[PDB]
């Protein structure tokens with residue numbers, strides 16, 4: 001059975017993302033490896049909802065002989081902003097489409113920035129529209145500039161695969177080679193995703209209660225990794241404490257192990273009922289640390305998406321929903337940024353009133369009153 005990998009086409013509008021997506025499904029349909037989805041159906045993307053946010057996004061699926069790919073493609077720049085920050089459809093690798101004619105453009109830069117900010121681990125470049133460029137040295141110019149763009153945002157720009165071709169020619173036989181070259185790069189450059197159960201154990205604590213004569217139980221849904229009776233864990237958030245999970249219980253049965261997705265109850269050895277609380281996390285020791293201060297790429301929701309008309313500003317103190325708890329925090333904006341209007345995104349500095357377990361790449365909501373006013377992805381954690 002083939003591993004499932006999430007990918008998507010990013011880049012500036014009209015550079016050929018939707019055309020490349022169609023060409024991939026057509027090329028693979030000829031080998032019985034994909035449903036052919038024509039360009040018109042990919043381009044007219046349907047709507048879907050990430051909580052109150054509506055995003056236009058096309059999902060298609062196709063297989064190489066080795067892999068099953070889940071592929072996303074969006075019409076508008078705003079769709080990519082919302083999809084990448086809210087994590088509606090996450091990506092193991094991004095296919096950066098850059099037209100060789102006009103070359104890299106504002107959304108080329110911004111989508112690379114967003115990919116880095118949201119933690120997309122690998123980039124593959126497809127230089128499109130080469131059928132329109134007669135001077136081959138100018139195609140190399142575009143490649144070099146895209147490589148420098150990736151390096152500017154800490155991607156290994158010298159090492160990423162860069163495929164040149166014409167998505168349109170492929171969509172209309174020798175023009176299939178860039179498609180095959182692209183798929184081989186996806187097969188070889190993007191590694192098989194490590195699955196949640198080999199990741200370090202983490203479970204946010206939802207509820208705490210005491211069994212008299214036995215000890216303190218914390219309940220929560222395991223986010224990643226495994227927990228087994230006898231394992232050592234740390235309680236992170238709000239001074240770090242070590243303990244042993246004596247027992248893992250789910251559906252009135254003691255488990256040999258709890259895995260990601262299991263809502264379990266963990267009996268904590270020697271933990272007083274008043275010293276652990278909702279919002280802390282159980283974690284494999286050393287795998288995550290408490291922080292009061294961190295940076296995060298934050299999208300400010302529009303009023304129509306459930307947010308407010310008011311922008312974010314220096315000193316704004318909303319609530320930060322970090323896993324199972326919400327904590328007051330104070331906003332600081334980067335240099336030269338005085339406000340963030342709804343619909344915009346920026347990297348903000350956040351200082352919570354008390355430390356919580358938080359890590360790079362973690363997503364969180366920002367709420368003010370009853371409205372969700374922002375969505376963020378942690379980009380940096382600051383030492384306590």
Ligand SMILES: Nc1nc2c(ncn2[C@@H]2O[C@H](COP(=O)(O)OP(=O)(O)O)[C@@H](O)[C@H]2O)c(=O)[nH]1
Pocket residue numbers: 012013014015016017018019020043075128129130131132165166167168169
């Ligand atoms: N000449 C040429 N035109 C292309 C190529 N790929 C796409 N186009 C034209 O792209 C216009 C926009 O590209 P499209 O895929 O719809 O947009 P995108 O998904 O927003 O980048 C249409 O004319 C596409 O057919 C190509 O490889 N060569």
Ligand SMILES: [Mg+2]
Pocket residue numbers: 016017018019043074075
């Ligand atoms: Mg498109």
